[PDB]
Ligand SMILES: *[C@@H]1O[C@H](CO)[C@@H](O)[C@H](O)[C@H]1NC(C)=O
């Protein structure tokens with residue numbers, strides 16, 4: 294079993310400023326749950342999201358690592374990647390784009 | 396054509412690996428790239444290879460030390 298992040302290339306979401314939002318990193322893992330982190334692209338550099346509220350929602354055959362927007366603000370517009378650390382391995386998701394309206 | 400934040404792996408546009416890592420598994424349209432840590436004393440050579448860091452001999456000085464991305468640089472004294 295390989296650890297996999299199921300975010301589709303060119304994935305996008307349209308969301309309303311002032312409404313709460315849940316951005317999901319769908320994780321396939323078989324044994325020990327990896328350490329996953331969100332980051333936001335500026336050009337070709339993924340700034341880790343350190344001060345941000347995150348949670349897990351576990352399902353039978355996949356698990357969701359959620360980045361919470363409480364609430365979404367206009368500055369949350371942009372591209373987000375999710376990353377998983379298992380031992381010496383680093384699994385890197387496709388970026389998903391948020392479009393905010395206000 | 397791939398976006399500048401991506402890297403061509405096959406005929407597929409994929410997320411890159413972080414500096415000290417080589418590609419251990421190619422991404423698909425729906426799945427992640429898998430990266431593995433190049434061990435100490437090696438540098439990421441291509442997308443996929445860790446190459447052993449060359450040693451500047453006694454008849455040479457180290458101009459730049461071996462990083463996780465680039466080999467040692469040697470010159471004559
Ligand atoms: C390389 O590192 C060694 C210590 O391991 C040090 O003695 C040497 O001066 C360094 N050279 C450069 C150019 O940084």
Ligand code: NA
Nearest residue numbers: 300387426427
């Ligand atoms: Na992915």
